[PDB]
């Protein structure tokens, strides 16, 4: 607040702490759905497409985690197979209009670097070992989200370059190149080569 | 005064009624008015100025006080007896170590061993008068500082300098203190104070490898600080506490100082012009550590200047030649080498200003003085390789390159060695151009370097000096060839044609070339490995910002409680690097974020000694830039709270007094560099073109303006404290610059600044009582 009001306003908002405490589903950050492709989305899991925050009724002083971007929920849903329509129903994507949704793009990049880390752990003790399954699902999911311009290709690639710069993640770079080959081979003729 | 007497009589009568009674609140109220009157500074000042006119009523005051104290002390109270004791102390009112003497002694030991004792005695008497130090604790801090600095010294020549500093400079300091002030009883007390500290003395004895307290007590007996009976019972105590083939360095130094005097008096005359005797004596000098012992004794005892004059005059005598044959000339060139190499070693160790003549009537400045002036690298001196000093002729330099390409000289019988040494720079310049074109092979370069470094070693030093200047100017990729020249000039010995004393001249020359090349070979990572000898060199971390260095060293100096030698060297390099303003401002910031009384007082007692690196410039920054910025800024003066603020006011007044009453070579160079217009900086609405008078006048105008204004806050408490320690710290003058309106205003803000300043004549009481009563 302003330095002249000060305590007079701040303590006031603190007395609205119990009301916000009434109107909070406890453990809402750690509750996760079971992804069904059926549609008819329950509106509990909808996030804000601008900032990945839960949409909150009122202007109360809610608990500090409810003002954070819910990346855990979105990463859990993107890691599941056939969670294509559910991510659109969460982030309000519509497919009649292309938008370049940025937080979706950053979450997809972080999913790629997480797959690259988990491939660089060993990937050789267990041949299947959930790694190549993850890379196949990443291929399918990322093809859809870059193809309809909900995310974009070159910003994704150069942000991916900034994440992998200096981290020294080299054992499964062939898989990452394969996924990029899926995008390029899918859409080289539609866009200019400078992309 | 009469009402105070009536109040004392009221307490006496009411206490007598209390004794006869045993609610008698009359004593409580009487004592309350006593402490309420006497608690004010106005009333106690008014009674003190009332003292003078009415003598012998004070006697009745104190006798009534004594009877009052008896009758109250018999019938004590859980609260009123403490009150009566407090009021009695008020009517009568009408340690730790001393880190500053420690750090001043350790600073003078580390930086200028060669300084005169009178400056040190003046500074120590100053410090003794600023904070009022008893004489036994003062001399104890001197001895404790000396021994601690000896123990913490690195092995090598610094241990020699510290042994010479304790055993030869400090007794002369105590002698001049005995002159310039019952000293034997105090120094004997301080010696018993010291002899309690057995672990310090045993650590020192392990480094000394002898009883260095015995040598101290015999030395202070020789100087006359101590009586002989005191010396003998102190040595008895020390032996009793001690019970639970090479000579040590202290005996060598104490016997080597008379050899310094007698070597002066015998080599005035060139051993009656016998240069072979000179060669024998100087070859004994270059035998291990003997030169360093003589120099440490001569530096600690003030005779380094005469020693340098003697070797310089010997050098001038051996510059030219006479009608000689082959053998006699060999001796004369060796005399040139020994005198030159020892003069370079002196100038690299004890500074260059002992080599200077400081007045040369006539143009006949010697060869070594000009060579050192224009051609030798020092710490703050970088040299121009194409200065006109390095380009003497074109005639002689072709004769010299033909001379170096002839063979092993064969013509040393007449060389005029000053001309040769001045010409080597142009000679190796042409050699370098020949090698850069490619017209000279590497193998002929080896021949020329052998002809330089073989017969006479000073030629290698002159060539390496020019090479260091020339490599410092070059770029990165262009350097590669010229560094090889140093690798051949500073390489291991050329053999089988050496004149005499070759290995010792090689050892001294390797030291000189280390200290010449070190900076350039730091710029590019190049290891030459000439042969620790540079113990305090390259101290800063390579990448860390320099405030972290400053705050870490000041944190460690506070948590120890004294300033090390290494810490003194890093503080010097930061003062040279970040400048005075940055240094003083950051140290004062680190003061002002302390919250304890003990740590603030210790930090101030250390920071005075740290600022004694360049006291004068630090006072100009402190009273001119830091304090007006803290007093004028309205957001800043919350930092001027009670605990750090009193300490800061103390440090400012100590700095002002010590700068008024009135030191390192970097600081001399940098203040000679500095240009500023203090008349323009302080426009001001004795000389008054001396900048310190201008800063003091400006500061006192600021103080009067702060005292006169409204909005009293912490800054007003600051200027109150500043004026109070100006009063208390003075003997009598910094306060000559005070505006006379401050006399009126200071007792409007209330007190001691009147009652001390008046000097108490019968008319002086009238002006005192006028000012003190009138708020």
């Amino acid at each position: 607040p302003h330095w002249l009001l000060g305590n007079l306003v701040s303590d006031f908002v603190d007395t609205f702490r119990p009301t916000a405490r009434i109107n909070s589903i406890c453990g809402r950050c750690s509750l996760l759905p079971v992804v069904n492709n059926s549609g008819a989305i329950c509106n509990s899991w909808k996030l804000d497409p601008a900032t990945l925050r839960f949409p909150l009724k009122g202007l109360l002083p809610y608990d500090k985690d409810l003002f954070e971007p819910q990346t855990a929920l979105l990463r859990y849903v993107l890691e599941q197979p056939y969670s294509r329509d559910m991510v659109c129903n969460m982030l309000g994507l519509n497919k009649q209009h292309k938008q370049r949704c940025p937080v979706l793009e950053d979450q997809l990049v972080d999913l790629v670097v997480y797959a690259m880390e988990r491939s660089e752990t060993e990937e050789k003790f267990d041949d299947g070992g959930t790694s190549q399954l993850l890379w196949q699902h990443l291929s399918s999911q990322l093809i859809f989200f870059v193809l309809f311009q909900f995310a974009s290709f070159p910003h994704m690639v150069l942000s991916l370059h900034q994440k992998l710069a200096g981290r020294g993640l080299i054992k499964g770079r062939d898989h990452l190149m394969w996924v990029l080959l899926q995008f390029i081979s899918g859409s080289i003729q539609k866009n200019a080569l400078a992309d | 005064l009469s009402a105070l007497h009536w109040l004392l009589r009221c307490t006496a009568a009411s206490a007598e009624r209390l004794r006869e009674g045993l609610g008698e609140k009359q004593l409580a109220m009487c004592l309350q008015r006593l402490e309420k009157t006497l608690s004010s500074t106005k009333n106690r000042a008014l009674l003190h100025i009332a003292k003078l006119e009415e003598a012998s009523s004070w006697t009745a005051i104190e006798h009534s006080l004594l009877k009052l104290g008896e009758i109250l002390a018999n019938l004590s109270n859980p609260q009123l007896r403490s009150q009566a004791e407090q009021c009695g102390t008020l009517i009568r009112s009408i340690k730790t170590g001393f880190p500053t003497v420690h750090a001043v002694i350790l600073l003078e030991g580390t930086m200028n061993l060669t300084g005169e004792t009178q400056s040190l005695v003046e500074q120590l008497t100053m410090v003794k008068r600023m904070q009022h130090i008893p004489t036994p604790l003062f001399v104890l801090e001197i001895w404790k500082a000396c021994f601690v600095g000896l123990i913490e010294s690195p092995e090598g020549t610094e241990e020699l300098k510290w042994t010479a500093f304790t055993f030869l400079k400090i007794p002369q300091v105590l002698v001049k203190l005995k002159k310039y002030s019952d000293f034997t009883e105090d120094v004997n007390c301080a010696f018993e104070f010291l002899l309690k500290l057995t672990p310090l003395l045993d650590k020192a004895d392990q480094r000394c490898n002898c009883d260095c307290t015995n040598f101290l007590l015999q030395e202070c007996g020789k100087q006359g600080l101590l009586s002989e009976a005191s010396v003998n019972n102190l040595m008895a105590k020390r032996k009793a506490d001690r019970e639970h083939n090479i000579q040590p360095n202290i005996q060598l130094i104490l016997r080597a100082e008379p050899t310094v005097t007698n070597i002066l008096k015998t080599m005035d005359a060139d051993h009656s012009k016998s240069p072979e005797g000179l060669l024998g004596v100087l070859g004994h000098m270059l035998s291990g550590k003997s030169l360093d012992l003589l120099l440490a004794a001569a530096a600690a005892t003030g005779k380094l200047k005469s020693f340098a004059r003697k070797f310089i005059n010997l050098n001038e005598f051996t510059t030219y030649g006479s009608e000689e044959s082959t053998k006699p000339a060999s001796v004369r060139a060796l005399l040139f080498d020994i005198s030159f190499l020892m003069l370079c070693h002196v100038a690299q160790t004890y500074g260059s200003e002992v080599i200077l003549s400081e007045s040369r009537t006539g143009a006949e400045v010697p060869f070594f003085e000009t060579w050192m002036q224009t051609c030798m690298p020092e710490e703050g001196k970088i040299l121009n390789p194409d200065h006109p000093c390095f380009r003497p002729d074109s005639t002689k330099v072709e004769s010299l390159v033909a001379l170096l390409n002839n063979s092993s000289e064969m013509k040393l019988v007449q060389m005029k060695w000053h001309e040769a040494c001045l010409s080597i720079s142009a000679a190796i310049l042409e050699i370098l151009n020949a090698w850069e074109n490619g017209v000279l092979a590497f193998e002929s370069i080896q021949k020329i370097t052998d002809n330089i470094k073989g017969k006479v070693c000073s030629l290698a030093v002159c060539a390496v000096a020019w090479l260091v200047a020339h490599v410092r100017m070059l770029g990165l990729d262009e350097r590669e060839k010229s560094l090889q020249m140093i690798r051949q000039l500073a390489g291991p010995l050329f053999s089988e044609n050496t004149l005499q004393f070759y290995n010792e001249r090689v050892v001294i020359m390797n030291s000189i070339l280390e200290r010449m090349c070190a900076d350039v070979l730091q710029q590019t990572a190049t290891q030459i490995k000439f042969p620790d000898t540079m113990p305090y060199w390259n101290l800063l971390p390579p990448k860390r910002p320099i405030k972290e260095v400053l705050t870490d060293i000041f944190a460690k100096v506070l948590e120890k409680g004294w300033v090390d030698s290494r810490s003194i060297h890093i503080f010097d390099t930061l003062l040279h690097m970040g400048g005075v303003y940055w240094f003083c401002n950051n140290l004062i910031k680190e003061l002002l974020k302390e919250t304890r009384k003990e740590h603030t007082l210790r930090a101030v007692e250390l920071l005075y000694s740290i600022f004694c690196l360049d006291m004068q410039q630090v006072t100009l920054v402190l009273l001119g830039h830091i304090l007006p910025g803290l007093l004028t800024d309205s957001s800043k003066w919350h930092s001027l709270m009670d605990p750090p603020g009193t300490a800061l006011a103390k440090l400012a007044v100590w700095c002002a007094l010590s700068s008024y009453s009135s030191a390192s070579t970097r600081q001399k160079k940098r203040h000679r560099e500095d240009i500023e217009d203090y008349i323009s900086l302080f426009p001001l609405d004795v000389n008054m073109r001396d900048p310190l008078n201008r800063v003091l006048a400006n500061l006192f105008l600021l103080i009067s303006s702060i005292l006169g204004s409204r909005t009293a806050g912490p800054h007003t408490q600051f200027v109150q404290w500043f004026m109070e320690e100006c009063v208390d710290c003075l003997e009598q003058s910094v306060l000559q610059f005070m505006p006379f309106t401050t006399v009126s205003e200071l007792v409007k803000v209330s007190k001691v600044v009147l009652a001390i300043t008046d000097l108490s004549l019968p008319l002086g009481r009238q002006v005192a009582a006028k000012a003190i009563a009138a708020l």
Partner: protein, 115 residues
């Protein structure tokens, strides 16, 4: 030093007042401080009524530095303080020094006639 308008206002006072300068407090840097008097047949309120006349007199009407400790411990002095303070409250803005002197005198007189 002292402005001419203050000198004229002083020269044209009623002989009841004996205005003088103030060398006691911190002055000669800000405003002009005055301890004048009350010399009248009617009994007087505490005499100093220290008045701080700021520079540029035809603006920033002067303010009386309050000193309540002397006006306490006495009923008459408390009454004169109360009435003179109320009369300063009722005084119009940009008042003069003569206005303060006259309202002080009339407030003392009101305290006399009341008790």
């Amino acid at each position: 030093s002292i402005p001419s308008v203050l000198q004229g206002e002083v020269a044209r006072l009623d002989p009841k007042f004996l205005v003088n300068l103030d060398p006691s407090h911190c002055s000669n840097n800000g405003t002009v401080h005055l301890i004048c008097k009350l010399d009248d047949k009617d009994l007087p309120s505490v005499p100093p009524l220290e008045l701080s006349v700021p520079a540029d007199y035809p603006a920033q009407s002067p303010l009386w530095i309050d000193r309540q400790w002397q006006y306490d411990a006495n009923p008459f002095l408390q009454s004169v303080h109360r009435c003179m303070t109320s009369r300063l409250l009722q005084l119009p803005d940009k008042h003069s020094v003569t206005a303060l002197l006259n309202t002080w005198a009339q407030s003392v007189h009101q305290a006399c006639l009341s008790a």
